[PDB]
Amino acid sequence: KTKPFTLPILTIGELTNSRFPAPIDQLYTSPNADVVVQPQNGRCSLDGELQGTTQLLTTAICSYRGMTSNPTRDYWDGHLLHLVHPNGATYDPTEDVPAPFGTQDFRGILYGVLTQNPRASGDEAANSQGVYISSTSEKFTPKLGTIGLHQVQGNIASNQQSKFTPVGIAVNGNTPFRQWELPNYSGALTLNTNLAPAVGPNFPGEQILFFRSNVPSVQGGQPIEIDCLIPQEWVSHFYQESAPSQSDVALVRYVNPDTGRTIFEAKLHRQGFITIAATGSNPVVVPPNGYFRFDSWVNQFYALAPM
Amino acid sequence: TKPFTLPILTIGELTNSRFPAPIDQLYTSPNADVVVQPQNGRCSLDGELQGTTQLLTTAICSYRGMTSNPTRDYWDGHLLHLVHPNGATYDPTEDVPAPFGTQDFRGILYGVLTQNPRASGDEAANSQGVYISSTSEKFTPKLGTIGLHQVQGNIASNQQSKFTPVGIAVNGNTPFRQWELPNYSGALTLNTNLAPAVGPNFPGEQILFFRSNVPSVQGGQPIEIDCLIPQEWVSHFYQESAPSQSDVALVRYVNPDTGRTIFEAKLHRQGFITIAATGSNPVVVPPNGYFRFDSWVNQFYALAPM
């Protein structure tokens, strides 16, 4: 008995980004000529193998948990956070992982709120500090078990069990948001380890199709766009189903149930990403009620209908 | 007939459906004299969502819309004119208690409001800490508006805004009451379209909850939020839509390595679990275990005691 492969039935307004906790807003395609596309969150094979720093919960993506240090006396990261995995499991740096699960996989400033010991303090927001976690910081060393926290609203308490809840991205004069550049998980000038592989098209006329979110920008005017290979719900679905991949390429179609007609077709690669026959950098427009659907296994030679 | 199933997810692989946080514990209580009628995390076993329940973790206790002009109110300095979290237009005539994901407790929800992106040398320029009290007279989400009380930074008027939840606050006059519903239209108007109240209706049984210890941002006590089924079960039932064969699915919490059943429970068609137990306490489970569907049983099926 061979279990058939399937996608969940979810419209674009029913999908979550697997690289930042936000709904999908757009589908987007680009040749990405001058970058290497190698995200570490939102990585799952079609047969259900999680890779990189990928885990199952939306709440763990770009989240951190652990114990704060004593003050560092550093100009930027006034405290460190000694990490456990988001599920609370002890983190062993010798694990065959790039970093704890859910660690941010871009170079940029992640903004969110650190919460620590409940306080009898009579102040509003007493136990909620706004913090910047820059993955260009010299103290961003999650592979080693520690990251730097730069407080921006309130004061971080030393030596307390703490949770970081992500909210958005900040950009400053020396820290552009670079979604396709990985952090150096062990610190400046070190080599990343245990990475999910880079992805790209391998058929003439094809480009990757991404699930895109415009996430909150808390400093700077540039809209912050984060592209994932598959949405978090697909990670969860493939993990659950673990259907055997019967070829290297699944043919999927985007259907409009209002008309019963498909809008476009695409290849969903066994590695866990989508390509389409398209050129240029632009959104791919879909009807709000439409959804992706698995139609059949095909092979590397299947020529897609162009968009 | 399509077989009913539960997803294979351990306790550390589950999300609270009433607040965006991982499940920390299973927990049981008699909840004496208290009506348990949450509106998030509500889904029947054949995949019908109820109350304000929707599918995304990111929409739970989140809000989206346009801020008003300054109100000059003592507490809610701005209103937020709501759409649903997915951006779909909301209107009060929808057959829902309130926009999807609206908080379903009486208390202060703390989080961050983000608005128009703008170039600035100021850190956190476009991220304001805000309290959304569901006990406020301005908390009328069924009518399309809620009140925002700023606590960190200044809210901008007339801007498209998103609220990202972070935790719960207890201030001088707002105890947290997880089982008391907002008056979604204000106290003078009845709530509508509610997912039904749940309870054991069986001597010696209690509800088993999926519990999260969520961030407590003001007040010295920890805050616990209990849901009837985790968000992943809502998602699973919605997709599968397996027809129910009775009112009660017998389920067993199993350890897949030892092969042992830890306990059995009744998963009710309405979308909640009961166990044969008395008292208020955690229900301890192996970290590698999970509920497994056993069989559909009679609506009056009796359980082995915990």
Numbering used by the authors:
A (entry chain B): 221 to 527
B (entry chain A): 222 to 527
Publication text:
The crystal of the native P domain protein belongs to the P21 space group, with two monomers forming a dimer in an asymmetric unit. The final refined structure of native P domain includes residues 223 to 527, with the exception of a loop region comprising residues 340~342 due to the lack of recognizable electron density. The two monomers of the OIF P dimer are related by a non-crystallographic two-fold axis, which forms the biologically active protrusion of the NoV capsid. The P dimer has a dimension of 55 Å×64 Å×70 Å with an extensively buried interface of 3,500 Å2 between two protomers, including hydrophobic and hydrophilic interacting residues from both P1 and P2 subdomains. The P-loop of the OIF P dimer exhibits a unique conformation, taking a ~90° flip, which results in its extruding out of the flat surface and approaching the opposite protomer. As a result, the majority of the S-loop is covered in the OIF virus. Such structural rearrangements destroy the structural integrity of the conventional GII HBGA binding interfaces that are formed mainly by P- and S-loops. On the other hand, the B- and the T-loops also exhibit unique conformations, approaching to each other in closer proximity with the N-loop. This special structural feature allows the formation of new HBGA binding interface (see below), formed by the B-, T- and N-loops, a scenario that is absent in all other known GII huNoV structures. Analysis of the native OIF P domain structure revealed that a glycerol molecule occupies the HBGA binding pocket, which was clearly visible from the 2Fo-Fc omit map. The glycerol molecule is held firmly inside the HBGA binding pocket by eight direct hydrogen bonds between the hydroxyl groups of the glycerol and the side chains of N392, N394 and T395 from the T-loop, T356 and the main chain of S357 from the N-loop. Interestingly, the glycerol molecule resembles partial structures (C2, C3, and C4 with their hydroxyl groups) of the β-Gal that contributes the vast majority of the interactions with the binding pocket (Compare Fig 5F with Fig 7C), thus explaining the observed interactions.
